[PDB]
Coordinates of C-alpha atoms and ligand atoms in Angstrom, one line a residue:
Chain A
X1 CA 14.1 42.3 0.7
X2 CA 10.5 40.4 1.2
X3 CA 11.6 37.9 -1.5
X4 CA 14.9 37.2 0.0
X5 CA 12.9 36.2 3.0
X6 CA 10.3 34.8 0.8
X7 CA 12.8 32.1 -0.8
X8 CA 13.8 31.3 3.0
X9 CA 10.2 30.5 4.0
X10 CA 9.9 28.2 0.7
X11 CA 13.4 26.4 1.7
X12 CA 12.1 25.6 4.9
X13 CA 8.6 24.5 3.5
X14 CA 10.4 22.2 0.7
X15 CA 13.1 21.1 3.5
X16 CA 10.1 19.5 5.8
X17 CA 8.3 17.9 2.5
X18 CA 11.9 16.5 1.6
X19 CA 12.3 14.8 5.3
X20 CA 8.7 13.6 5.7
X21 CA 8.8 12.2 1.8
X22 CA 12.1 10.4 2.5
X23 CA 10.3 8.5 5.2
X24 CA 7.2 7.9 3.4
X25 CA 8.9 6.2 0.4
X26 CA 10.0 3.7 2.7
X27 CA 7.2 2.9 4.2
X28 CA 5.1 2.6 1.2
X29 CA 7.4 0.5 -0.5
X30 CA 7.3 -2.5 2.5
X31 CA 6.5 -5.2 1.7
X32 CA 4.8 -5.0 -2.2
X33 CA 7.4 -2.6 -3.5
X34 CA 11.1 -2.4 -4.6
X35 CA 13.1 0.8 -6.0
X36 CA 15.9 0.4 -8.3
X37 CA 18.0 3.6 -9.7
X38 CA 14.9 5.6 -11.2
X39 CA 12.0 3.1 -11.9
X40 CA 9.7 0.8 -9.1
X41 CA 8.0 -2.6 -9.3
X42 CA 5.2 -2.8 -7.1
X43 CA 2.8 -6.4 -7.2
X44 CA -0.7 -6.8 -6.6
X45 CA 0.1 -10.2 -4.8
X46 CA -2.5 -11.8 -6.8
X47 CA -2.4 -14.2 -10.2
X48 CA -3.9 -13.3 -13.3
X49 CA -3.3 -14.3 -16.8
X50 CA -1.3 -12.2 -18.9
X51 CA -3.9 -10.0 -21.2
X52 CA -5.4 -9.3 -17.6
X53 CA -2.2 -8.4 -15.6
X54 CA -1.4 -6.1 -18.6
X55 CA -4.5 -4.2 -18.6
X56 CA -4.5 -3.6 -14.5
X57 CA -0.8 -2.0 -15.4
X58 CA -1.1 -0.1 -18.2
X59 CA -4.6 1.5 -16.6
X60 CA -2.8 2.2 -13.3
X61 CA -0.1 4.4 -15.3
X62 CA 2.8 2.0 -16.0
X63 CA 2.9 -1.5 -17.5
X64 CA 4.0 -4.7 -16.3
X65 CA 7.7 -5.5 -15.3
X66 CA 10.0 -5.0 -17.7
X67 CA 13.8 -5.6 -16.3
X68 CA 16.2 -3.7 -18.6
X69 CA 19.6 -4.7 -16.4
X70 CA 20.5 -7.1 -13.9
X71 CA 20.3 -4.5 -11.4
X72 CA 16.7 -4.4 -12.1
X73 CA 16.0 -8.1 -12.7
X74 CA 17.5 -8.6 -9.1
X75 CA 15.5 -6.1 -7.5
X76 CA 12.5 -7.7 -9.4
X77 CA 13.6 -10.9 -8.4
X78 CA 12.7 -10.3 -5.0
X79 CA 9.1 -9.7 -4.7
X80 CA 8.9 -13.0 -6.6
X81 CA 10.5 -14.9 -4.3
X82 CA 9.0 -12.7 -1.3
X83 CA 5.9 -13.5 -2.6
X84 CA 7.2 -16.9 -3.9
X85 CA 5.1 -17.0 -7.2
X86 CA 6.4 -16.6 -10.7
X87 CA 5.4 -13.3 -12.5
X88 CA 4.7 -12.5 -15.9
X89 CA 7.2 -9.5 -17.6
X90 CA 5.7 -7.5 -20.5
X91 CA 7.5 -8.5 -23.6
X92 CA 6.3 -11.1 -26.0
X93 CA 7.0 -12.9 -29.2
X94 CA 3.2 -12.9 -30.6
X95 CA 3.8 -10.7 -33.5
X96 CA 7.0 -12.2 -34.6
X97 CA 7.8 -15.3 -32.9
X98 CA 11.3 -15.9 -32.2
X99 CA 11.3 -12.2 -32.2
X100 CA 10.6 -11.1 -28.2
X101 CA 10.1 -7.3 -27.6
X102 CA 8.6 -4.7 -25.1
X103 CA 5.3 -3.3 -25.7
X104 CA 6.4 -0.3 -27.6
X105 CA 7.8 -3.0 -30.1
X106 CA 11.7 -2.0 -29.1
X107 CA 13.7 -5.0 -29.0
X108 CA 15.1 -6.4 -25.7
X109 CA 17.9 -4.6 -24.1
X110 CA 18.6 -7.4 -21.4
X111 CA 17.4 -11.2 -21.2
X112 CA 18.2 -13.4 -18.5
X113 CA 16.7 -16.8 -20.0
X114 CA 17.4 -20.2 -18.2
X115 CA 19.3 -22.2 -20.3
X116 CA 17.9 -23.3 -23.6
X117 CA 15.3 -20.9 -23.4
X118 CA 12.9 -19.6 -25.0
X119 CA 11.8 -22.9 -26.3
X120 CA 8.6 -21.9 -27.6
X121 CA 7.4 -25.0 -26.2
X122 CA 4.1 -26.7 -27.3
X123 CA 4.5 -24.3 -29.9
X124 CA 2.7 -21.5 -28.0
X125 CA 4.5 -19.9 -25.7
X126 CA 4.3 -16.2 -26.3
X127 CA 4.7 -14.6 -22.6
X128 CA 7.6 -15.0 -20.6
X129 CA 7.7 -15.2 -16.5
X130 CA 10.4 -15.1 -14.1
X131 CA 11.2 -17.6 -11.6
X132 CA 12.1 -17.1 -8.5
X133 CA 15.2 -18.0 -9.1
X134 CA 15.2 -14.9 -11.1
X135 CA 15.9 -16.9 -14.3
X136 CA 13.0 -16.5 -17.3
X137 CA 11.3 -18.8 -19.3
X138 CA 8.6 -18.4 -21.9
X139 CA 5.4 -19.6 -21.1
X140 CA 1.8 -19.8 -22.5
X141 CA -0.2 -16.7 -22.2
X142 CA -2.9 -17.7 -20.6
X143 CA -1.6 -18.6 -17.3
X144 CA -2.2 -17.3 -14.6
X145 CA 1.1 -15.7 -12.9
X146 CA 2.0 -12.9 -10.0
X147 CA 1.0 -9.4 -11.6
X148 CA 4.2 -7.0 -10.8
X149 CA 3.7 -3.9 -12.4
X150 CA 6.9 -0.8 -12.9
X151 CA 6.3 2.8 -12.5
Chain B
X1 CA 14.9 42.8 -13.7
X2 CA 13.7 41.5 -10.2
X3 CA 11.0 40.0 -11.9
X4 CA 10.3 37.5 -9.6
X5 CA 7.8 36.2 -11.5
X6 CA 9.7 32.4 -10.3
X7 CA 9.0 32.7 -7.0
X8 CA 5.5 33.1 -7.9
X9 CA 5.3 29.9 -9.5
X10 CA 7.2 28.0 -6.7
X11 CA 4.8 29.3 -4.0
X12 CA 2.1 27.7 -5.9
X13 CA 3.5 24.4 -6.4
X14 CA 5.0 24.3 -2.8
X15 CA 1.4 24.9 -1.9
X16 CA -0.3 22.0 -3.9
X17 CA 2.4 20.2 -2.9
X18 CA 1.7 20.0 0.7
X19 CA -1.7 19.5 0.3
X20 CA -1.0 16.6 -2.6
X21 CA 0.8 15.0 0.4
X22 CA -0.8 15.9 3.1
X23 CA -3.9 13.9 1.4
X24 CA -1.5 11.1 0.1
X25 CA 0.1 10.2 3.7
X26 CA -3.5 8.9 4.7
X27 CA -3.8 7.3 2.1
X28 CA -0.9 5.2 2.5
X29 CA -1.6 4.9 6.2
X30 CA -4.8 3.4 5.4
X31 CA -5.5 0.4 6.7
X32 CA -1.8 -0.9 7.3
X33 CA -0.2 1.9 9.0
X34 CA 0.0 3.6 12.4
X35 CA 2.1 7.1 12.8
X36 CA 3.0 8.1 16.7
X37 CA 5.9 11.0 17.2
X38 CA 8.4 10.8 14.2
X39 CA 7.8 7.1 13.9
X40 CA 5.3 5.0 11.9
X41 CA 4.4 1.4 12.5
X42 CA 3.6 -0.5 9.2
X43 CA 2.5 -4.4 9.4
X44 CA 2.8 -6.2 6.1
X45 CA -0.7 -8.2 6.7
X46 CA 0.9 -11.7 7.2
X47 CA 2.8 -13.8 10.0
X48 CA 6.4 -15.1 9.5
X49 CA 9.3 -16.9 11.7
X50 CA 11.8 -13.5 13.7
X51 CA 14.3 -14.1 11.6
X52 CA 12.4 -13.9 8.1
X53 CA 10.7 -11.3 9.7
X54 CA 13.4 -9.4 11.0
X55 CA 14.9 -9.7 7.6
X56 CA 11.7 -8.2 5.6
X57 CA 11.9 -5.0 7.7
X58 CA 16.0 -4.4 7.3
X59 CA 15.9 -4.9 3.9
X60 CA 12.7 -2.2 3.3
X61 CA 14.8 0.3 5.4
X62 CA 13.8 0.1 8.8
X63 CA 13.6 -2.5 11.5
X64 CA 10.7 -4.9 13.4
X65 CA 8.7 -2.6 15.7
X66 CA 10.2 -1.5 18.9
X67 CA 8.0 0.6 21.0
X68 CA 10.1 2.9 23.7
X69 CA 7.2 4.5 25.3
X70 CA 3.4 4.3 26.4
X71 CA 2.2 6.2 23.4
X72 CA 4.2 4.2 20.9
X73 CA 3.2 0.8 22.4
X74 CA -0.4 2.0 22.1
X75 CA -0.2 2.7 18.8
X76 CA 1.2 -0.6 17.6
X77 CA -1.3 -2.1 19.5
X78 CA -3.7 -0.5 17.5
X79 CA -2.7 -2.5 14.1
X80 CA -2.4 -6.0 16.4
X81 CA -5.6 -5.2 17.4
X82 CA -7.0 -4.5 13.6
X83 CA -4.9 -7.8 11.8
X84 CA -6.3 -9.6 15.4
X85 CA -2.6 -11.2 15.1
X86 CA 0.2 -11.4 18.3
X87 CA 3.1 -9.5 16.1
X88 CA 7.1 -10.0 16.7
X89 CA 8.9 -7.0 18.4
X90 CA 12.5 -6.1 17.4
X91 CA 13.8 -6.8 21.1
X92 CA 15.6 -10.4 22.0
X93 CA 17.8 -12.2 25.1
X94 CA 19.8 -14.6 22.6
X95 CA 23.3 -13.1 23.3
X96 CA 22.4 -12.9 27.6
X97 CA 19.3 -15.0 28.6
X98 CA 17.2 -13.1 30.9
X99 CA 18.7 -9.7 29.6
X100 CA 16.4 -8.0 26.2
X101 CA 18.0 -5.9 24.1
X102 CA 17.2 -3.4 20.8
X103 CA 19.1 -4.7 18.2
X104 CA 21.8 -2.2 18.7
X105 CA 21.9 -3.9 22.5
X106 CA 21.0 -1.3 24.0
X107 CA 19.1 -1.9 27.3
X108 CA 15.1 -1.3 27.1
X109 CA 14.2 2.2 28.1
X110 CA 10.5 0.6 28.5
X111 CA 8.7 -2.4 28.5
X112 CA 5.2 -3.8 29.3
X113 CA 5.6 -7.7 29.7
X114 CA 2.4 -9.4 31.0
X115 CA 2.5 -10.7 34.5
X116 CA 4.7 -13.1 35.0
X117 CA 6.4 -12.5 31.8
X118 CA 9.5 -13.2 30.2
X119 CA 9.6 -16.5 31.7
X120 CA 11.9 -18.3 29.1
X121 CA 9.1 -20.9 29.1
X122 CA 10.4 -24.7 28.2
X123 CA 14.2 -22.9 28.4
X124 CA 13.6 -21.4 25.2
X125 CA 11.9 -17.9 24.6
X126 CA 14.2 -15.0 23.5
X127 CA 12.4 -13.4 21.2
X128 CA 9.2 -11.1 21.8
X129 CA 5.5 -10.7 20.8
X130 CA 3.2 -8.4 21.6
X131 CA -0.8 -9.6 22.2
X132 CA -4.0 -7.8 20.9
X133 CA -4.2 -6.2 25.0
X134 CA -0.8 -4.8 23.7
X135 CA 0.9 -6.8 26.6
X136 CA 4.5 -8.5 25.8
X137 CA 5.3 -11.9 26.4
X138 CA 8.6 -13.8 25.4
X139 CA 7.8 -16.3 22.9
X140 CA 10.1 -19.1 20.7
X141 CA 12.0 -17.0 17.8
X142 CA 10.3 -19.9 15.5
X143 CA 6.9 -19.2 15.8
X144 CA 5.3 -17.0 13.3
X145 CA 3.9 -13.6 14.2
X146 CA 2.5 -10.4 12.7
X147 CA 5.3 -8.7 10.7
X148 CA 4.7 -4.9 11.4
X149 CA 7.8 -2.7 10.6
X150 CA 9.1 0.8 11.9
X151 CA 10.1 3.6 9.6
Chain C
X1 CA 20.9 40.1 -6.4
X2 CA 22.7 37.1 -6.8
X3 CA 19.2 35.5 -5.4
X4 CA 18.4 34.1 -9.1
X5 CA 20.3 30.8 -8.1
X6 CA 18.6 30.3 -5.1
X7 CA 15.1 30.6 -6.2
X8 CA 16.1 28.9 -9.2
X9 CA 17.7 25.9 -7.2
X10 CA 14.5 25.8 -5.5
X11 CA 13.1 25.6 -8.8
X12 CA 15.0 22.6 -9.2
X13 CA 13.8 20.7 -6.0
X14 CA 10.3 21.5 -5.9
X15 CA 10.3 19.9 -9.3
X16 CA 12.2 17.2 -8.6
X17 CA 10.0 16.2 -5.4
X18 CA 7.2 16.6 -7.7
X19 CA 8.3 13.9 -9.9
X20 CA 9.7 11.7 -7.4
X21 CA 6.1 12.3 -5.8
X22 CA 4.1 11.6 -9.0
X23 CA 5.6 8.3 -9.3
X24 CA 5.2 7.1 -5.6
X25 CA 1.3 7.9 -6.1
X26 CA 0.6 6.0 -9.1
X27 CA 2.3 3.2 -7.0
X28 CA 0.8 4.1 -3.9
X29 CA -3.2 3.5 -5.6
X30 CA -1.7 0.2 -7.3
X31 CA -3.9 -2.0 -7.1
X32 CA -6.0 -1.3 -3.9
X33 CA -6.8 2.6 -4.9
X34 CA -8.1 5.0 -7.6
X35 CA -7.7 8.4 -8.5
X36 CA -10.7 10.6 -10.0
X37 CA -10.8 14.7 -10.0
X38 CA -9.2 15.8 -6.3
X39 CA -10.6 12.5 -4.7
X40 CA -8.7 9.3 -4.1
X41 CA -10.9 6.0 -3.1
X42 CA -8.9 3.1 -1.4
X43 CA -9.9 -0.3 -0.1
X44 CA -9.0 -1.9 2.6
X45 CA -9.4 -5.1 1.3
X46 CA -11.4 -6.7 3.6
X47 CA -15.0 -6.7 4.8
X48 CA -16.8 -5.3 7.9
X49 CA -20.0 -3.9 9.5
X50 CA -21.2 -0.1 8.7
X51 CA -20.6 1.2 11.6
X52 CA -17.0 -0.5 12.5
X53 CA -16.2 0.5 8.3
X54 CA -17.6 4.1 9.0
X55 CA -15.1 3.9 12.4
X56 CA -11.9 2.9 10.2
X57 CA -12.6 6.0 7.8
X58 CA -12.8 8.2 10.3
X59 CA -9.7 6.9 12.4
X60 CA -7.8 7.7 9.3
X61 CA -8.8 11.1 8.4
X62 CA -10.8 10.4 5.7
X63 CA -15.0 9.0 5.1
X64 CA -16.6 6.3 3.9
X65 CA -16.9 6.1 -0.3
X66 CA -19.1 8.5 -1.5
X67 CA -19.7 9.1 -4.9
X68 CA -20.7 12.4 -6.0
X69 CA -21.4 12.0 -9.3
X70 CA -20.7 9.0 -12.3
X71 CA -17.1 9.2 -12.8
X72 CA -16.6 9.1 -9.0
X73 CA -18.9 6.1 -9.2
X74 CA -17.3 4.7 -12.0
X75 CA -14.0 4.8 -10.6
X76 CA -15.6 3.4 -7.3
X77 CA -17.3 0.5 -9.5
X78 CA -13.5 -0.3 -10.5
X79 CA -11.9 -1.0 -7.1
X80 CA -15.7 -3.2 -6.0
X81 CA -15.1 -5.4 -9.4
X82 CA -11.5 -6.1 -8.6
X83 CA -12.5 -7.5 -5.7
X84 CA -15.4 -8.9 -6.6
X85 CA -16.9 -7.4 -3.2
X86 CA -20.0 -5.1 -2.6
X87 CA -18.7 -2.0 -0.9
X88 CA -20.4 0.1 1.8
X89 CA -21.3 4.0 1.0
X90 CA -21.1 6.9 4.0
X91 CA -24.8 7.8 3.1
X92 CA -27.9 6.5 5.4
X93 CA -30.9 7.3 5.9
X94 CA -30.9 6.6 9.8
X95 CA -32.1 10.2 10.6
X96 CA -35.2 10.1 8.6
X97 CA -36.5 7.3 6.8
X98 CA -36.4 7.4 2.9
X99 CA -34.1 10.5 2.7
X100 CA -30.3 9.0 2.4
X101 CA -27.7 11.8 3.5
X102 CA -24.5 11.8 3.7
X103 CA -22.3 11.8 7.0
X104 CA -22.7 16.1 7.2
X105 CA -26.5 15.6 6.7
X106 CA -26.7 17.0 3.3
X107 CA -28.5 15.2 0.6
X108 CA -27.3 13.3 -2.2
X109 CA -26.4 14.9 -5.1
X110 CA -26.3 12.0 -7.0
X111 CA -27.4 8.3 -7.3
X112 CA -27.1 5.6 -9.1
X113 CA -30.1 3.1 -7.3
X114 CA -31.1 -0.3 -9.2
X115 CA -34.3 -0.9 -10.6
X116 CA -37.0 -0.9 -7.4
X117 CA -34.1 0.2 -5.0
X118 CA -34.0 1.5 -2.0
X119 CA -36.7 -0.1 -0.5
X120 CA -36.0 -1.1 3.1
X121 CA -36.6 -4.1 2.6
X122 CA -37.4 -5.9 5.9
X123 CA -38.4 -2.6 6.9
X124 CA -34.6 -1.8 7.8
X125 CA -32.0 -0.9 5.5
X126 CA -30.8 2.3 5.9
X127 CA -27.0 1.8 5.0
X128 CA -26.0 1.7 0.7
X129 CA -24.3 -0.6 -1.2
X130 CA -22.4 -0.8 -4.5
X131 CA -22.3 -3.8 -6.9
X132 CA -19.9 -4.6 -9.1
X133 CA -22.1 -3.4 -11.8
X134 CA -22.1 0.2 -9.5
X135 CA -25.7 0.3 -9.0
X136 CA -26.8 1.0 -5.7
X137 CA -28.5 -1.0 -3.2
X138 CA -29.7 0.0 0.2
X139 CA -28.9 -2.7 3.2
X140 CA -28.7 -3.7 6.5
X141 CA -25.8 -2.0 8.1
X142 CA -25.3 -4.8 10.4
X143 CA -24.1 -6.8 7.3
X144 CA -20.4 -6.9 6.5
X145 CA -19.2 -4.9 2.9
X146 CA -15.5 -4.2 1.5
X147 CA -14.6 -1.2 3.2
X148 CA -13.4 2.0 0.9
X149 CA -12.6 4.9 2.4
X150 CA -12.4 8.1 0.6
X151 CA -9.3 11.6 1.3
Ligands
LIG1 O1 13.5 -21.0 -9.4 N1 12.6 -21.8 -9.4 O2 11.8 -21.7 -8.4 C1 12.3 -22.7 -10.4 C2 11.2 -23.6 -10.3 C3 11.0 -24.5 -11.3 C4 11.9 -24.5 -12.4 O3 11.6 -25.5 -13.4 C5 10.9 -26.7 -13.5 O4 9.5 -26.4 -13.8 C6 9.3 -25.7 -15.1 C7 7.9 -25.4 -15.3 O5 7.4 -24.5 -14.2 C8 9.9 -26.5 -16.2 O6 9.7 -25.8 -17.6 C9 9.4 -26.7 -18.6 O7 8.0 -26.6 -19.0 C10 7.5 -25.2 -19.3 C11 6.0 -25.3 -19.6 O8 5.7 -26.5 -20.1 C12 8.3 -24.8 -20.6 O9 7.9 -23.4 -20.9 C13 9.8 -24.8 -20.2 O10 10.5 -24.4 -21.4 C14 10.2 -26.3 -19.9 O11 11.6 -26.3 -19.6 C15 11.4 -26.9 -16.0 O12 11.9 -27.7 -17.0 C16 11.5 -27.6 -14.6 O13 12.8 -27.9 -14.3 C17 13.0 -23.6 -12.5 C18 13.2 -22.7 -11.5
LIG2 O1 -4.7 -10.0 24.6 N1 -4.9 -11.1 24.2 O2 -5.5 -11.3 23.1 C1 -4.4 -12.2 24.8 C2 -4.5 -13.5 24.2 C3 -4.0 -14.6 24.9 C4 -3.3 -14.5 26.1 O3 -2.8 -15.7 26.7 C5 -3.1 -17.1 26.7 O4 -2.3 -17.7 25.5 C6 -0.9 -17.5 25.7 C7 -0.2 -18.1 24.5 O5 -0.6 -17.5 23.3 C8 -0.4 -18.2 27.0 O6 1.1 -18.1 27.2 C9 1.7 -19.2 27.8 O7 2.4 -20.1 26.8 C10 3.4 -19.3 26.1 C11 4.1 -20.2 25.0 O8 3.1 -20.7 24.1 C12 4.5 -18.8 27.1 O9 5.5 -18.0 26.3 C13 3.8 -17.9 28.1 O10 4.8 -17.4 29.0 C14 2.7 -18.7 28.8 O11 2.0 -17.9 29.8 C15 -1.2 -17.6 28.2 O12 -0.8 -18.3 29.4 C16 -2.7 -17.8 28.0 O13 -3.4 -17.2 29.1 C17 -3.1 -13.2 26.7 C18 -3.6 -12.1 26.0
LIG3 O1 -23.7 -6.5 -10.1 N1 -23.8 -7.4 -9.3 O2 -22.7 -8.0 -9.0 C1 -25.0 -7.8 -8.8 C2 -25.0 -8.9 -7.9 C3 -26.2 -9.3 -7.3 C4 -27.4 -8.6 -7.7 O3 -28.7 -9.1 -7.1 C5 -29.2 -10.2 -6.5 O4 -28.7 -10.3 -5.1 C6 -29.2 -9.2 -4.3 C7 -28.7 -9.4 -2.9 O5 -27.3 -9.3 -2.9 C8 -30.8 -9.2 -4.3 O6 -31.3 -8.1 -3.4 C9 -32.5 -8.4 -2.7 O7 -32.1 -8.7 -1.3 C10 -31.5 -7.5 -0.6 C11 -31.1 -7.9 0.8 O8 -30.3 -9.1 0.8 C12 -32.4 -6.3 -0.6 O9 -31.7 -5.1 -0.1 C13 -32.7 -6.0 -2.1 O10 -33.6 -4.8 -2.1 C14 -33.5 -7.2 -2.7 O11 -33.8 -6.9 -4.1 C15 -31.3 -9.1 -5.7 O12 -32.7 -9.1 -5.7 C16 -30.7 -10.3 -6.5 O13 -31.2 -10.2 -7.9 C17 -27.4 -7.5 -8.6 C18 -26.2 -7.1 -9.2
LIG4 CA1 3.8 -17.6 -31.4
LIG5 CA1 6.8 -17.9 -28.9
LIG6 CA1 9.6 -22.2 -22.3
LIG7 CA1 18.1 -18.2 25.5
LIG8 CA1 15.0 -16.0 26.9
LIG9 CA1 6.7 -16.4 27.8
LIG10 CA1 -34.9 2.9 9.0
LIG11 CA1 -34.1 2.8 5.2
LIG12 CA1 -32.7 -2.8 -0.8

C-alpha cells in the first residue's frame, strides 16, 4: 500500500515540474527563440560567415536552421525579421552544385527560393540565406549572415 | 509480481529532475530575468516603440510588464535598474484619457506614478514607463523604452 | 493491482519532460553558456567591476566562474573567446596576500597562471582574470571584465 502512495507523491512531484516548465519555456524562448511542432530555432543575434555559424551549432548540439515545411520556415522567418538580418540555413550545393542538400547529404524536403533562384551567381554561391521576407536565395559562403541555430 | 522495480527508476529521475531544473531556472534568469510570486519579469535587452513592443511580448506568450503590487514593482525595477533603461508597462488611457487600464481594462489595483504624474503632457501621453527609481510616469506610446515581458 | 498503468503512465511523463527538458537546455546555453560535468558557466554579456560582477552572481544564486580544473577551464576559455572579453574569476587573494582562495576561503585546486603571473603588479591585484587563450592573470578588481557566473 506504500507504493500506491508512493506513485501519488511522484504525481504531485512531476505535476509541479510540469507547471513550473510550461512557464519557463516561454520565458526562455523571448525574444531569441521560436518553437514550431517538435524542433526550436534559437539565434545568437550576431553575424558570422557560414563555416563559422556552422561550427558554433553543430558544437552547441544542433546545427544551423534547416526549415523542412512552411510551418517551420514561417516560424524561422520571424527572428529574421525580428532581428531584421538575413540568416544563413545549413544546406549547400558545394559537393554537387546544382545539387543543394542538408548536412547529412539528404536531399531537400522543402525550398522556398525567390523566383529564379538559385542562380549560382558569380558562379560561387554555395550557401543559401533567408530574407526577411522569408524567401531564400543562394549566396557566397563567406558572408557574413545572422547565425540561427535548431535544436 | 509487484516488482516495483519502475517506481524505483522513476524516483530517481524525478529526483535529478528537480535538481536538473532547479539549477537550470537560474540559469535562464541570469542576467535578463526577475521572478517575484508566480510571475517572472524578462526584458529582451533593447528599447522599441509600445506597440512593437507590446507585440514582441503577445506573440512569445505573455504580455508587457504590469506590476500589481509593491513587491512586483520592486522587482521589475530591479532589471530597469540593471539595463539603466525607463521600460514600457502594459497599462494605457487611449480608450478614456485620464482613466489607465490593464489590457483586459480592468482598473489598476496599484500604481506608483511620480509626483505629479500622469499629466498627459503636450495632450498626448497614454502609455506608461517606469524609471530606474521604479517610479511611473505617462509618456508618448512612440517613444522607445525597455521591452521587459511577464510570463 | 491495476497500479501498473499508473506508474507506467508516469513512466511516460517523467520521460517526456525529460526530453522536452533536454532540448530547452541545449538552447538555453546557446550561445551565451556552456556545459561541463554538473557545472553550467553563463555570461552575461557585458563587462563590470569585481565586486558589482561578484554582486550579480550572488543575486542570482550562483558564483563567479571558477574553474576547478582544465576542462572547466577550457570550457570557460570558450565562452571568453566568443566574446573576445577577459572574464573575471571568484578567487582573490584579498585576505592574505599571494594565497588566491576562492569565495568559501579554500585554496585553489587548480590554476592555469601565465608565464611570470600573479604578480601584483602595482602592488595591488588581488582579483584573476582569464584570456582568451585561458591563462590566468591576476588584476585590479576595480577594472571592468565580462562577467560569468557559474550554478
Ligand atoms: O525581404 N527582403 O528584405 C529582401 C531584401 C532584398 C532583396 O533583394 C535585393 O538584394 C539582393 C541581394 O541582397 C539581390 O540579390 C542579387 O544579388 C545576390 C548576390 O549578388 C544574388 O545571390 C541574387 O541571386 C541576386 O538576385 C536582389 O536581386 C535584390 O532585389 C529581397 C528581399
Ligand atoms: O529615476 N530616474 O532615473 C529618473 C530619471 C529622470 C527623471 O526625470 C527627468 O526626466 C523626465 C523625462 O525623462 C522628465 O519628465 C518630464 O517630461 C516627460 C516627457 O518627456 C513628461 O511625460 C513628464 O510628465 C515631465 O515631468 C522629468 O521632469 C525630469 O525631472 C526621474 C527619475
Ligand atoms: O590571450 N590573450 O588574448 C591575451 C591578450 C593579452 C595578453 O597580454 C598583454 O596585455 C596584458 C594586459 O591585458 C599585459 O599584462 C601586464 O599588465 C597587467 C595589468 O594591466 C598586469 O596584471 C600583468 O601582470 C602585466 O604583465 C601583458 O604583459 C601583455 O603582453 C596575453 C594574452
Ligand atoms: Ca559550387
Ligand atoms: Ca552553387
Ligand atoms: Ca543567388
Ligand atoms: Ca489620450
Ligand atoms: Ca493620457
Ligand atoms: Ca508624464
Ligand atoms: Ca593585495
Ligand atoms: Ca594580490
Ligand atoms: Ca598580474
Amino acid at each position: 500500500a506504500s507504493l500506491r502512495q508512493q506513485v501519488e507523491a511522484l504525481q504531485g512531484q512531476v505535476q509541479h515540474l510540469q507547471a513550473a516548465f510550461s512557464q519557463y519555456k516561454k520565458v526562455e524562448l523571448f525574444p531569441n527563440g521560436q518553437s514550431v511542432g517538435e524542433k526550436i530555432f534559437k539565434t545568437a543575434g550576431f553575424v558570422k560567415p557560414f563555416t563559422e555559424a556552422q561550427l558554433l551549432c553543430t558544437q552547441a548540439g544542433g546545427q544551423l536552421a534547416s526549415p523542412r515545411s512552411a510551418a517551420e520556415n514561417a516560424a524561422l522567418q520571424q527572428l529574421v525579421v525580428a532581428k531584421n538580418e538575413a540568416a544563413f540555413l545549413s544546406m549547400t550545393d558545394s559537393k554537387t552544385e546544382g545539387k543543394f542538400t542538408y548536412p547529412t547529404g539528404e536531399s531537400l524536403v522543402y525550398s522556398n527560393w525567390a523566383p529564379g533562384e538559385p542562380n549560382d551567381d558569380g558562379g560561387s554561391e554555395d550557401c543559401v540565406e533567408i530574407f526577411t521576407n522569408g524567401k531564400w536565395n543562394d549566396r557566397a559562403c563567406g558572408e557574413k549572415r545572422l547565425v540561427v541555430c535548431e535544436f
